[PDB]
Design a protein around this ligand. Structure first.
Ligand SMILES: OC[C@H]1C[C@H]2N[C@H]2[C@@H](O[C@H]2O[C@H](CO)[C@@H](O)[C@H](O)[C@H]2O)[C@@H]1O
Length: 343
């Protein structure tokens, strides 16, 4: 009852910097989003006192490229029993991205953690450059011992997959598609983002030839897909149609340091009871895999990574009290155990 679970995927963000490694506190400093409804909202400067999160990391303003931080993160995945790190991927095409991905794979392998990619909506993303990038990632990293495979296939999560028409997806994902990956060296499990109602999403997923779907959002009720009372029926549909459903569960949500106008999306943690309810619903739906939003999306307040109390002259941060800083790692391990009992 301590082993890693390789059907548990934790969304991981590698965009943080520190002075020690990067020469800058990247992402800890962040622009404030204007209200979508002549605004000069400003920027959070990423100083010790004022970072782009409502919470404060136990590890401080860390770099995602610091091998010592990465070691600690992998030890945290081990504590949480989460066997797969689902790495945000933005197609930066820069040496710093390449170095960091290699460091993450190397650190993961030391702890028997696996890595898969979460393909983000990069500029001009389309099925042709997606194919090229899938080929690139499999070619570059597919022989790394930490690269994730399920039944011989890589797995990719595709964020905002609805931004691309099913007629385009079918070219890549139907066995007869014009630029198919099916039956090729680059075949993979492609997990699209289920957002809205079944009348829209069922034909989208079928016509796009996705292997499965996930829901991402940590805030219950943000979308149809992130409303856990829909998960039993979503799983039934998935099983009937040979699709893999990977619901996303998270411990809470708050992004109001970077999106001050987005308070209606706040979901309170209630000393773990929110996380418990969401994780229970995923397990009760009878799914074969679960995704966790998030390890370390600090901007969105969905992180399970340890956080500490902090009051600065500029902001009084939220924290996990009356739970301890590692509570969400140990509670994740509890739920992984419950999930494994159900498999
Ligand atoms: O990983 C999927 C999305 C999840 C959530 N992290 C956001 C999205 O990224 C956007 O918002 C963050 C702030 O929360 C910005 O730092 C990014 O630049 C922006 O793309 C993820 O795409």
């Amino acid at each position: 009852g301590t082993e890693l679970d390789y059907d548990t995927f934790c969304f991981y963000y590698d965009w943080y910097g520190s002075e020690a490694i990067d020469g800058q506190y990247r992402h800890w400093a962040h622009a404030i989003a204007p209200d979508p409804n002549g605004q000069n909202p400003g920027t959070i400067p990423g100083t010790q006192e004022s970072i782009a999160s409502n919470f404060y990391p136990q590890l401080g303003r860390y770099s995602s490229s610091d091998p010592n931080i990465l070691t600690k993160h992998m030890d945290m995945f081990v504590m949480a029993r989460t066997g797969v790190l689902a790495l945000t991927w933005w197609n930066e095409q820069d040496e710093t991205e390449a170095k960091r991905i290699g460091l993450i794979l190397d650190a993961a392998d030391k702890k028997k953690i696996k890595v898969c990619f979460h393909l983000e909506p990069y500029p001009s993303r389309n099925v042709q450059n997606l194919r090229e990038n899938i080929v690139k990632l499999i070619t570059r990293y597919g022989n790394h011992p930490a690269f994730y495979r399920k039944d011989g296939k890589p797995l990719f999560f595709i964020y905002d997959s609805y931004l691309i028409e099913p007629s385009e997806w079918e070219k890549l994902l139907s066995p007869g598609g014009s630029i198919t990956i099916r039956n090729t060296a680059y075949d993979a499990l492609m997990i699209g983002l289920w957002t809205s109602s079944p009348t829209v999403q069922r034909p989208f997923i079928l016509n796009a030839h996705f292997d499965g779907f996930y829901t991402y959002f940590a805030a219950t009720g943000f979308t149809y897909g992130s409303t856990p009372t829909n998960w039993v029926s979503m799983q039934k549909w998935a099983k009937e149609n040979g699709k893999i459903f990977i619901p996303s569960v998270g411990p809470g949500y708050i992004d109001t340091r970077i999106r001050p106008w987005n308070g209606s999306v706040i979901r309170t943690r209630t000393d773990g009871q929110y996380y418990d309810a969401m994780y229970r619903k995923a397990i009760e739906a009878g799914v074969s895999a679960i995704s966790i939003t998030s390890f370390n999306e600090w901007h969105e307040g969905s992180q399970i990574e340890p956080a500490v109390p902090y009051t600065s002259s500029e902001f009084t941060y939220l924290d996990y009290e009356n739970r301890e800083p590692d509570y969400y790692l140990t509670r994740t391990a509890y739920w992984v155990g419950k999930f494994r009992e159900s498999k």
